[PDB]
Design a protein around this ligand. Structure first.
Ligand SMILES: Nc1ncnc2c1ncn2[C@@H]1O[C@H](COP(=O)(O)OP(=O)(O)O)[C@@H](O)[C@H]1O
Ligand SMILES: Nc1ncnc2c1ncn2[C@@H]1O[C@H](COP(=O)(O)OP(=O)(O)O)[C@@H](O)[C@H]1O
Ligand SMILES: Nc1ncnc2c1ncn2[C@@H]1O[C@H](COP(=O)(O)OP(=O)(O)O)[C@@H](O)[C@H]1O
Ligand SMILES: Nc1ncnc2c1ncn2[C@@H]1O[C@H](COP(=O)(O)OP(=O)(O)O)[C@@H](O)[C@H]1O
Ligand SMILES: [Mg+2]
Ligand SMILES: [Mg+2]
Ligand SMILES: [Mg+2]
Ligand SMILES: [Mg+2]
Lengths: 483, 483, 483, 482
């Protein structure tokens, strides 16, 4: 964001009494009511129903990028992230103007023997950590770019010159080499503040240890609040080095830097972080958070969350004919097919809608859902089979599965509907004619007479009189044409 | 591109309310079917092919330069242009204060208590920089130079003192460097405005980083709508820093200016952006639409696009003894020799027609098309056969291949056609005929009967009316000759 | 941040005619009476002698910051500021055109018969730059902040859409660098106008030359009159660079911006510009106005400015036992203890009364001046010894010291002067009298006649005739006193 | 000055198809060549009745904006025009496809048809002009205004050449020969927009490497001239002597074209007065010597001196302005100044600047003598050297210049402005002679309106000669009553 100037509020918690950093943040919110703040959806009216199908295709393909329904887990995630972001500023207070005289007076008093004991310097260290482990397509990056986004970004302080970089989010590289996770940090920080940390610290040839030590020198001047490392699966066990080297790099990174680093990954990456007790102890600073796909029934009774989700997204459909009441057969087959993962349901919506408005029909049917499932979900069937089987031993084997290049498929469907339109009514007059002899006659007789009687008279002459040659058609055609 | 005084009206959507520069744009409601209104096609007359081979040659020569068939994909591109020009400027409203003022006011509201939770979402609306990628010769330049032509370049405002440059078309010159793109951006802006800036800006003391800021100042000053950086394929990657640094230049350029920008390139130039767009990030920007050649069959059915295009080009040829219909074998050879790209299609059709006129046999078939392809279209053979091969790696190898100086070859062959002096029977038919009016009688009554028994009987029996209509003269020829 | 609408007033000078930036400025014709309109002083009443000691001390505390004496140097500085500001605008006339069009037209004419001769010079007016050099404490800042406050800061034109920023001021800080001045430019511009230039064009990654170009074009987008840089001494000689690099940067800054730029410097800062000041060329500019301390000995006669200043300041005293007429010795001694630096003139005068209010008798004597000099003038002892020595090198090298933290000393003196329990005969004589006005007769008559029987006589007279003023009573009060 | 090129033909046969010469201002005859240099101040009649500070400010700008072209500026303008327009004929881009012509000549010369041919490669040397004259005679203000008729830069559309018509270089107060090659780049990247200083003028390069780098740049841009000014300011011990400073301006024959110009004092011509080498190359196009104006060249006084004196007289800003110049004042100028340009205008400016301070408001010969003896003290020996007429003394004292007279003008302006404070009511204090009167007034001013304090105290001291301070007060109050 931009340099939002600080406006101070007094948090009721005693431990945050004097910090400008904690008091410049948005106020504490109730965790029960904080879930409703994330909700967002598109706006629909009755006027847009009767519109060209290209604009409708655009406004229904924008659904997955602008629809977000808060779930049960969002409240816990928001609470944990708030505690992490506001609990790492206690030992990093800036206002210590009266420290020298206090410490010197205590030193004199304990030196003369008047005082029994005194504590000169204590500042607290070690950085908390948390991991958010879940399967791909479960909304770990859609729901964490909103909970983390209700906060501001870089905040300037008028009295000091420190700018409080509230958060920073980096993604791991495909090759996963550790020299690029320590190098994406500089670019992600440059794109926020607007500096040249890359040229000064990255292009220069420093070792991994030196480049890791320089990170804590620019993560201390600008009071970083959080550092989230995403797509840890790509870095996990790629061409980066040994597993011991990876684990020790993460341990040393958590130790050196003073900010609450968070890790996100697929359950395949759980095994490396449970390698030794040191890494498990450091990573599980606030326990662990695991994300489970939605079940159709909570405990025997049907899931209220499932009904609410596939009603609040059901009512977002844009079709000529749409029934408000959703049948239970569609719901049952939908839980059978999509298995509850959040990424596949919205893709099923958009794909089925595009195919329906391209094939002419204006209703979505369970048969259409099955057809789309067999048509354009081929790469994800191993993952969905693992989910539906209920055997978790090899779920992590296929948990990395993503639909490849689905966006280009969406663009191809949009191109197909745009190029197919609804019909070609201007060429229906030519479509009435079925013989090439009649086509020839119309072609030569196009300029002679108006097109109003070119089709009907020729068609009647060719139909009422069954067979003849091409040459003898024209005199009878003109004889009919005069009257 | 002249000076039009701004006139205001009401928009279809309230989201663009009261913005002066958006309102001054041409209205959106009247363009119900812009594809039909953009269909430019030269129409031949009944008797323009009158003993004048020069006129026919000029008419055929004008076809590659003055033929435009709008497909259904151009409707999608027009919709994207409209969305990008009308939805990416809502932030820069001169009536309101600024985005920063709104963000700070919302922060004050949420800190005080009036507003519950402000969403610091870095409000930028769409602001997506489309990446238009297609094979060379597909018609991208000729499509964006005509769809972006119903918009006046400079709409004027009298209330303020700002000139609105609605669109600016930048063409990257051959063997270009990374500085001359900014230089000719300035040149095009001066040409479209009339105020020089290169004298005080285009000085070699400044570096490329300074030119970017000087560009950003002018861009924010005039509130320009779109920027199109065309022909990235023609630049030189040797003089510049390289592919890795030009990507940095591009991302800095799109990020700093803040206006929507579109890039036009070849699949070979995709290699520059492969490192960025292939990364899984919906927030990374650089959205793309792929220009694919139209195919004969998709899912086993013949596409009507090829049929319509071939028919439309078929009715616009001038040949004395042409065949009215296009054979299935002829279309099969067309697809086997062109494979979908359109630039080779029009040049091949024109060259085949003129060669058939020149060599004395006028009927385009597999043999004549094969001869003209083996005689003139040999330099373009590699890529045409490569697209039939269909290997994606092979296409980008020779994607840049364009036939050299084909306009010079066109003028040379036009000069060469004048070398013929032999007389064809239609010359005798049109020379032994006296008057201007009766000339089309031979043209439209040649198929049924031969001229030797045609002309005497009809010239004797035309004496029913001294001023007979050429339109009304059909029946006598057929009815009085079979007797 | 003043926001005044412009109104156009005609100017009598021929060269100034028809220019809409110079007519909105305050009229030149009023300069005759505006030359000496800056006089200001505190007002003292005879009733302020009988008021309480602490509030008298508070009144004396405000002597330095509300007393101003116009000298001969302020006249010259005001004339030069007026000329520079109003003559740097003649070139930039937005109603007829710029320089380049005129030069091109003149060259076109001289290439033909018309306009036999032309002068290819520039109406640059030397781009006036003033290097105001003087010893610290001479009173430069608090005169440039009083002769530049008469002009409205932001004159806004409504026919056009530009804000005529008549003057903009840049200040310096401790241990400054070259880039800090450039950022302070945008800081001051945002403080004045209220725009947001700093956040979107004051990024940390920009170099000096890019920042210089950005400054040059932004200061021309808004009509700017003057760029004043104050306290160039505080720039650091180590972190920014050597003497040559600062000189080169300042020369580049003056040359590229275009508007007149004024510089405020100390004799040590003159060492930076020794090279260009020695170059006897006035085309570039860098004319120097030399501040000097107030020198009594002028052409073998005390400077009438010194006598006027010292008498005006001496009438501003509040003492119960004050001496009426200044003696030659008492003024002379604090002349050699003042050295003409006027900063340590008003400081000594305001400290003398505050110390004498507690040291004993209430009279400004030479001894208390001497003890103040030996006690609280320690930092500027070598300042003044260099000044009395008269060696140019010693006075040049020994400058910049400013007697830090006078405020704490003054307030401590007020707290200490509060706690005096003893009442002098002057103060205890008050309680015997009753009305506050009637002590005026006592003050007029205490020194010349014995007061012990005088004050009963005052009671007698006022009690005998209550309802008459002091002036009516005075002759009869005297005749009762003596006769 | 990036002026685009417009070509006009010229009457000379040698400038037929030359872009560089035809893109220049047209040839101007001898008559109107001097009228374009003239400049004078306006000084309308409304300026006479003004404030003294603004009038002194206007007076302190007469030398800056007053130029009277004499009879010796026309010759210099003509020679500069010939020098600029004659050094381009060998550098013109008017060359067709010479390869075919040269090959044809080569094939024809060896078969006996043509006896001889000419395969030309290089032509012409650098013309040098040695303009030397006494310091203070005006060799720079009479050169800037002559060069100000030509545009500095010209841009050609068909080609890609920026014809930098001239370039002026200044020498430092104590500089070697290595500080003349840095000034070239530092002035060329200012005349144009470039960065030659940080690219070519490094520290590693020697004198010869930079002197050879200058030629490539002076031929990339068709540099029409190069003026080196104040050779006198070079130090003869930091450079090498009079044989490494004489050889350095002779080795500037290797610079292609660019007809250089050298300006110096008759004591800096001792560098070139060691041989004919720079008496031939340096005097390759003449050697013009400035001569101060002589009052009587013939029996009749010359027109130059009287015209200059009159046209300087008409710019007086004085309330009591003398209508006509008198003969005695003119003779005083000629005796005191001896014809030096920098001294006549300086005497006039300082005289009418002191007239304001002393309040006389008239220019007198005694005032001229006073200001000459007061201010122009260091440049006396030059004046007696000129008066005696011995060339040795004149050459010995030809670097004498007034040191830092701008500062002296600043204190003069300050002194004029310091007088301006005059207040009528303080004439009471002037009337307030007796200290007892001051004591009485300071006490009694607040009691009664200050209007009648003056007459009351004046009457009190007039009627009674002496009395104690105490008894004066009842009588003063009695007078205030009546
Ligand atoms: N609660 C939700 N409601 C609606 N859509 C969701 C929800 N959670 C996730 N999605 C959708 O899932 C899609 C992909 O999420 P993604 O970023 O791939 O998560 P992850 O990276 O953890 O797999 C997003 O486009 C988003 O629209
Ligand atoms: N809609 C269209 N109808 C017919 N021909 C077209 C159409 N669009 C493009 N073309 C053909 O494409 C050719 C120009 O292609 P061009 O725009 O240069 O491709 P690129 O932008 O890849 O270089 C023209 O000769 C034209 O005949
Ligand atoms: N002409 C003046 N009239 C009245 N006070 C002055 C004058 N010049 C200086 N002063 C006093 O000197 C004090 C310090 O001046 P300062 O701003 O430090 O000057 P500088 O910045 O040139 O050192 C101010 O408090 C001011 O009251
Ligand atoms: N022909 C002239 N007419 C009027 N003033 C002149 C003339 N020549 C010189 N001056 C005055 O002499 C002053 C200094 O001359 P300058 O050329 O600097 O001396 P030098 O030739 O020694 O460098 C200039 O300010 C100018 O006003
Ligand atoms: Mg993810
Ligand atoms: Mg193109
Ligand atoms: Mg100051
Ligand atoms: Mg000189």
């Amino acid at each position: 964001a931009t340099r939002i100037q600080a406006v101070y509020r007094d948090t009721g918690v005693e431990a945050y009494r004097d910090n400008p950093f904690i008091e410049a943040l948005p106020p504490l919110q109730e965790s029960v009511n904080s879930a409703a703040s994330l909700k967002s959806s598109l706006q629909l009216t009755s006027s847009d129903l009767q519109k060209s199908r290209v604009i409708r295709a655009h406004t229904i393909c924008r659904i997955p990028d602008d629809y977000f329904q808060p779930l049960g887990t969002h409240l816990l995630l928001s609470e944990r992230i708030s505690v992490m972001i506001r609990g790492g500023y206690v030992g990093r207070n800036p206002k210590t103007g009266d420290l020298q005289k206090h410490l010197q007076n205590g030193y004199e008093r304990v030196q003369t023997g008047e005082l029994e004991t005194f504590r000169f310097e204590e500042a607290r260290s070690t950085a908390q950590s948390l991991l958010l482990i879940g399967c791909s397509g479960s909304g770990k990056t859609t729901s964490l770019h909103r909970i983390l986004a209700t906060y501001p970004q870089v905040i300037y302080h008028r009295e000091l010159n420190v700018e409080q970089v509230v958060y920073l989010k980096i993604d791991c590289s495909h090759n996963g080499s550790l020299k690029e996770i320590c190098l994406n940090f500089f670019r992600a920080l440059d794109r926020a503040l607007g500096s040249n940390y890359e040229r000064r610290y990255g292009l220069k040839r420093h070792g991994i240890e030196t480049m890791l030590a320089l990170m804590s020198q620019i993560a201390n001047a600008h009071a970083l609040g959080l550092l989230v490392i995403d797509e840890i699966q790509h870095l996990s066990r790629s061409r980066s080095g040994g597993s011991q080297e990876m684990l020790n790099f993460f341990v040393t990174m958590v130790n050196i830097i003073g900010v609450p680093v968070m890790l996100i990954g697929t359950p395949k990456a759980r095994e490396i972080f449970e390698a030794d007790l040191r890494s498990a102890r450091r990573g599980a600073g606030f326990g662990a958070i695991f994300w489970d796909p939605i079940q159709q029934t909570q405990r025997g009774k049907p899931n209220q969350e499932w009904i609410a989700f596939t009603d609040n997204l059901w009512q977002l459909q844009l079709l000529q004919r749409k029934d408000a009441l959703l049948s239970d057969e569609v719901r049952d087959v939908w839980y059978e097919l999509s298995q509850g993962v959040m990424d596949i349901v919205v893709k099923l919506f958009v794909l089925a809608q595009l195919r329906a408005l391209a094939l002419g029909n204006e209703r979505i049917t369970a048969g259409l859902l099955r057809q789309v499932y067999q048509d354009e979900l081929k790469p994800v069937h191993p993952m969905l089979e693992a989910l539906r089987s209920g055997i978790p031993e090899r779920i992590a084997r296929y948990s990395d599965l993503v639909v490849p290049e689905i966006d280009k498929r969406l663009i191809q469907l949009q191109l197909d509907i745009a190029a197919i339109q609804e019909q070609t009514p201007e060429e229906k007059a030519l479509q009435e004619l079925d013989t090439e002899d009649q086509r020839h006659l119309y072609l030569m007789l196009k300029e002679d007479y108006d097109s109003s009687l070119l089709i009907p008279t020729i068609k009647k002459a060719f139909s009422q009189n069954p067979t003849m040659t091409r040459q003898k058609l024209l005199p009878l055609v003109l004889q009919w044409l005069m009257e």
